From Swiss-Prot:
<protein>
    <recommendedName>
        <fullName>Cell division control protein 24</fullName>
    </recommendedName>
</protein>
<comment type="subunit">
    <text>Interacts with AXL2.</text>
</comment>
<feature type="domain" description="PB1">
    <location>
        <begin position="6"/>
        <end position="80"/>
    </location>
</feature>
<comment type="function">
    <text>Promotes the exchange of CDC42-bound GDP by GTP. Controls the polarity of calmodulin, and the calcium regulatory process of bud emergence. CDC24 may be involved in the initial selection and organization of the budding site.</text>
</comment>
């Protein structure tokens, strides 16, 4: 991915890092044709105008509280 793409979806206040990876995995590799290549480690647009490195359920529960800290529910993603 030398072009650079984003993934802004709608997450809930219950979605775990697992459920999160499912959404992405469904938008990155959900079709069964021949061979697929899923992912796990991804980046997200933090509240500082710059993508950061998300750990797991930890940075997920934190990043979540940051979204609802105002009125945001969508989460951005990167493909490094």
């Amino acid at each position: 991915g030398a072009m650079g793409s984003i993934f802004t979806l709608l997450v809930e206040k219950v979605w775990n890092f697992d459920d999160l990876i499912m959404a992405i995995n469904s938008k990155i590799s959900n079709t069964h044709n021949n061979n697929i290549s899923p992912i796990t480690k991804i980046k997200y647009q933090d509240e500082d105008g710059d993508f950061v490195v998300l750990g797991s359920d930890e940075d997920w529960n934190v990043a979540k509280e940051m979204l609802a800290e105002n009125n945001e529910k969508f989460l951005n993603i990167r493909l490094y």
